[PDB]
Curated annotation (Swiss-Prot), chain A:
E.C. code: 6.1.1.15
Gene Ontology CC: cytosol
Protein family (similarity comment): Belongs to the class-II aminoacyl-tRNA synthetase family. ProS type 2 subfamily.
Keywords in alphabetical order: Aminoacyl-tRNA synthetase, ATP-binding, Cytoplasm, Ligase, Nucleotide-binding, Protein biosynthesis
GO biological process, one term: prolyl-tRNA aminoacylation
Top-level lineage group: Bacteria
Enzyme class, first EC level, given as a word: ligase
Catalytic activity: tRNA(Pro) + L-proline + ATP = L-prolyl-tRNA(Pro) + AMP + diphosphate
InterPro entries in the cross-refs: aa-tRNA-synt_IIb, aa-tRNA-synth_II, aa-tRNA-synth_II/BPL/LPL, Anticodon-bd, Anticodon-bd_dom_sf, Pro-tRNA-ligase_IIa, Pro-tRNA-synth_IIa_bac-type, Pro-tRNA_synthetase
Protein's job: Catalyzes the attachment of proline to tRNA(Pro) in a two-step reaction: proline is first activated by ATP to form Pro-AMP and then transferred to the acceptor end of tRNA(Pro). Can inadvertently accommodate and process cysteine. The misacylated Cys-tRNA(Pro) is not edited by ProRS.
Name used for this protein in its record: Proline--tRNA ligase
Length: 442, 441
């Protein structure tokens, strides 16, 4: 039943020109488009339009974890360092890690991740191979005290993550739980119109020899990559994919082609198997990573189950992160033109925006009032720019904040019974009837 | 229409009562698999409990937006400096989580957001034509409490809805207060709480006008002083005109004696209220409104240009709801010897299908069918398909507080009937299957 919003009733501080302080296109637009505000180095406030988007992103991620079988919960932001000496990653994050002391001086910390929290929870409740496979997950704020925070949401200190965690009896199991997630990630980024490409990766302080990062190609990458062009026509699986079945063929299908970050690149291995014309070397933004770590946290923390053969054994685990806040940036770094942002439909803070091209005119007002109420009812997320500005000004803002569809309402069109519908993508227009428009959009 | 099978879930039911849990809300939340303590006063929300938190979240959200307030989100960590800028730097004393990063800069884990929302306001809003404006967010606050007691009712890490209003004068802020007031009335009623508005001390937040919202209890931490008569009054309906005149709604809620344990004046309680009406009892505060005027705008130089062409600092208020606390309260108000009694609006599921002869071809098929069909009609449904005995399923269902239970038993099903049970009062009704999937819709 349709999100709805008049601009006179809102909080969108658009910015004149380009903030001295922003180095890349995504940070600039987000600042310009009234989405974001820095409150500290790498710590941001999410202003209402920006918050609106973050939610859309959240919900997609959620839906897809859920479709893959994972169960949501929420862990707290602060964790006892005690937990961390137990697995002994106490010093694994180093300077990058934020330690706190309470009013009783108790080694706490703002959690950069939750491998140890989730294991502690798993071991409290789950005792039998029957309970498995299990995949708990949350979408919660993390803090990494990055040395030099940059690029806005892209490299910040307080940031949002969906982190999930899988729990199987043995190796062959977890290799399945791994693939579920792998597929679910393929869909996730695709539903946000981004071709995120699976690439072999390095586990860092998270353990394991299996890990893929998902990387969207760019012209500003924290990481540089070497791929074969063809990895870009590969199909993604549709909503009816059976996660309960054998997923190997898709995984095969998504790895047989050369894909590598610069961390695990091998040129001698590469020129071997690409035609010289498909080679696209380029930079990319890591939007997520998936890890299999066997018994890292289960061994040294005693996360055992009694298995089908009678005896106790530590479970085989994995973990999987999606940069939910980083996705805002990455999406914009891959969906913009000189006029501003171009949101893909699923993530747009509104589907359509009504631009009243002569405010205060009884006719345009009545016509815009009605479209807005009709569009809301048909369950369409609608922004009505009822502010008191001129045609060019309204076109400028509408472009900038990258709403997918624009409806233009003005004197000479409406006198004849027609408005104009502008698709932001390519910028194509059609003159069409006021009756029509609402139907054609829904 | 949200859907879950218990054999696919994560629901760690606890047998007895955990010895470390004094009040019932807490101990139930733990039995019901809703919660784990990770540190004193700090919690992980287990799947069942998160569902509920989210439904509470959403109820607050809806009424806030109906009241015309606008949602953003502020970060958890704030800079010390901001607090110097206002002189609340010392205001939370030892209840303040004070951090330093790898650069020796002083951060703090926000116990509230009055300054920051001012920092954001002063940055962008310059003209009185931009007001009234109310900005709210739902976000984890922190208070290092002396000794964290009573589970989610008095933790250190908690979830709050903190809303903040901005007006040009005295008059414009009353207007904005009044709205939230009405909005808080509708909010808690939507959880099936009688939350009673009472005059309150403003503490570190400041102000000479503040109403605290209290549900009556016995094992509650606040001492309260009203007269019984308040408990009848109407709760404004979903169709109020917020833009219009609310004062004669505030008048019938303010105007019988409502006072907490502070601000309580006794040679002033016996007089304004007659003999048989008086009642010294206790409660659980679940939200507080504050009007503070220029406390923060003065100090942080947040001015707008007014109607006459001059600058002046804005008049503010703030409005909070202890979202995570409400779980406690609701349970404390909604329970019996058998478990929780979730109000329809906040229940993690509306109905639970209990298969009373698990693995049996008939009852299975009949359950697989109801399940698929309620989900299809958008009814949040939980199928307890656990390989377990009848008594156990009844027990659990009761424990976790789902408002409706569907009992599918072999004899009952052998003739097209299934028993529907309302958890409130244990009303039952033997119904045909077609009958059941409707009805509940
Ligand atoms: N400083 C940061 N700012 C923004 N996003 C980040 C930051 N650090 C990580 N991310 C995002 O979060 C994702 C998960 O990060 S990760 O550390 O590589 N993997 C993990 O933490 C594992 N626990 C998987 S749950 C990253 O792929 C990236 O998209
Ligand atoms: N330690 C705590 N644990 C759980 N809930 C709390 C805690 N402290 C306060 N709350 C809830 O949060 C509500 C608002 O808190 S407050 O401190 O009175 N108000 C404020 O902080 C306002 N500045 C925010 S608008 C309280 O009415 C209470 O129900």
């Amino acid at each position: 039943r349709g999100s709805h919003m008049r601009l006179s009733r809102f909080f969108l501080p658009i910015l004149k020109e380009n903030p001295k302080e922003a180095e890349i296109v995504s940070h600039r637009l987000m600042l310009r488009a009234g989405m974001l505000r820095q409150e500290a180095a790498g710590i941001y406030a999410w202003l209402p339009l920006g918050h609106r988007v973050l939610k859309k992103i959240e919900q997609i991620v959620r839906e897809e974890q859920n479709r893959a079988g994972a169960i949501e919960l929420l862990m707290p932001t602060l964790q006892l360092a005690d937990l961390w000496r137990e697995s002994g990653r106490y010093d694994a994050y180093g300077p990058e890690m934020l330690r706190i002391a309470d009013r009783h001086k108790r080694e706490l910390l703002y959690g950069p991740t939750n491998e140890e929290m989730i294991t502690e929870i798993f071991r409290a409740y789950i005792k039998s191979y029957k309970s498995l496979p299990l995949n708990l997950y949350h979408i919660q704020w993390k803090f990494r005290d990055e040395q030099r925070p940059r690029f806005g949401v892209m490299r910040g200190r307080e940031f949002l993550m969906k982190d999930a965690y899988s729990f199987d009896v043995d190796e062959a199991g977890a290799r399945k739980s791994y693939n579920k997630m792998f597929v679910a990630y393929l869909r996730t980024f695709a539903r946000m119109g981004l071709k995120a490409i699976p690439m072999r990766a390095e586990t860092g302080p998270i353990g394991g020899d299996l890990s893929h990062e998902f990387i969207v190609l760019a012209e500003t990458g924290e990481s540089g990559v070497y791929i074969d062009r063809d990895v870009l026509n590969l199909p993604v699986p549709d909503e009816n994919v059976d996660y309960d079945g054998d997923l190997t063929p898709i995984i095969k299908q998504w790895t047989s082609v050369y894909a590598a970050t610069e961390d695990v690149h091998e040129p001698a291995r590469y020129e071997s198997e690409v035609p010289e014309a498909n080679r696209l070397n380029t930079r990319g933004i890591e939007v997520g990573q998936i890890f299999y770590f066997g018994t890292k946290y289960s061994d040294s923390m005693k996360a055992n189950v009694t298995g089908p053969d009678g005896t106790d054994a530590p479970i085989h685990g994995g973990s999987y992160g999606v940069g939910v806040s980083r996705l805002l940036g990455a999406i914009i770094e891959a969906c913009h033109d000189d006029n501003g942002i171009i949101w893909p439909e699923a993530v747009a803070p509104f589907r359509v925006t009504i631009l009243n091209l002569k405010q205060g005119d009884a006719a345009t007002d009545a016509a815009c009032d009605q479209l807005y109420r009709e569009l809301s009812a048909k369950g369409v997320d609608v922004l009505y720019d009822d502010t008191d500005q001129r045609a060019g000004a309204k076109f400028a803002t509408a472009d900038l904040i990258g709403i997918p569809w624009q409806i233009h309402v003005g004197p000479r069109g409406l006198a004849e019974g027609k408005v104009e519908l502008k698709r932001r993508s390519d910028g194509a227009r059609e003159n069409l009837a006021l009756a029509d428009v609402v139907a054609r959009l829904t």
